[PDB]
């Protein structure tokens, strides 16, 4: 079964705010450090990032010219249909279909304004969704 | 495979004591709050309920005219055949078949009078049973 | 797939030292209490037993004339081939085949004399074995 | 499905530093004790070893002439491609293929010098790999 073609960029091109996949988890880069120990060697990059879904800190150290996978992020608007303590039921405003998003995949800052009828900015990465903020 | 046709009611029709399904768990409603922030918008209902089987507190906030699933509850009488620390063996007085109910699915107030020979009120929701009280 | 024909006895026939199956676990009866609340009703028995394999306390309350399953226990002698912290390797002295028994299934009192070359009394219940004591 | 032919040696031939398999885990022998209780019996060996992969202490007591399985250890050199907090990506210098090794399978003393570009000594036992030290 196919899904998409993996997209890559050189590690040296990443910057704070960029998105990268580390050990299967799409992450947002929070810090990057460069170094060069080899007199005639390649520069290395040490990336620190945070998981978009599990919020876990991850690191990756590799040559600046080595490829790193970048997640494809689709952004769209949805309307909240209902809110339970565990799931947010949404109506995709693009095709009007109903999508369920776990409460754990809601940006902390947006949890406080979750209410039926409100519109939210949603991000889809592969088969998972994350509610970014209210309005959108 | 089919089982039953899901039954629904509008959220605004629920009352304390009503039964509803929230995230797959049939629950008894313990409190309902109504609100209306939109000048010309729909009123919203915030439901607080307790899981019939796991006893967990659950909440659901949605428009008063949105459909909410209501569990089908079949009530019947059974006779206790045996009682272990983990399972209550019962004889369904309708067809005389033997049914096993986990001790965790016995209302706390009824656990104290569980004894072989006693009759109990039993509730069946889908493929699970709950012992409500002794006698029935 | 068939295995054996379940053997039963009336609860009222059990005594301290008897073996019974409670919720799938073969247990040794440690105490039995009898009672009779119904003027013209059946006497009831409250059995307290201990799991042969998990060592857990279990109880069963039912009429004295109700059937209770009794495990089939096959006793034989085996020679210890090797002993690790987790498994005892044995040679069945009946057919000379090698059988492995988890350390958790060794009577506490026998663990202290487990040594290669020693003979032990082994009990087999269905597909599980328990080392009872050294010598046998 | 076949893999390899199990290799054995007599327990009495093992020495500190030897490798043995105890309950499915390849281990390095750290201590061996010999004894002989039977006037005309066989000498026994008590082996204490440490798991190559889980680092767990294991013991095995058996006759000195009893067979014990010895793991086949293939040693080779690899170059580190990248290092995350959970996985070390390596290039097998024999065929240039990429192999991923969990951080837990890296000798503690080598973890401190893990860096892209460094060469490491790698050990393969069946389908698992362990990074022994930097350089190799």
Curated annotation (Swiss-Prot), chains A, B, C, D:
CDD domains per record: S1_aIF5A
Organism: Pyrobaculum aerophilum (strain ATCC 51768 / DSM 7523 / JCM 9630 / CIP 104966 / NBRC 100827 / IM2)
Protein name: Translation initiation factor 5A
Residues where Hypusine is found: 39
Main location: cytoplasm
Biological function: Functions by promoting the formation of the first peptide bond.
Protein family (similarity comment): Belongs to the eIF-5A family.
Record's GO cellular component terms: cytoplasm
GO biological process: positive regulation of translational elongation; positive regulation of translational termination; translational elongation
Localization, UniProt: Cytoplasm
GO molecular function: ribosome binding; RNA binding; translation elongation factor activity; translation initiation factor activity
Keywords: Cytoplasm, Hypusine, Initiation factor, Protein biosynthesis
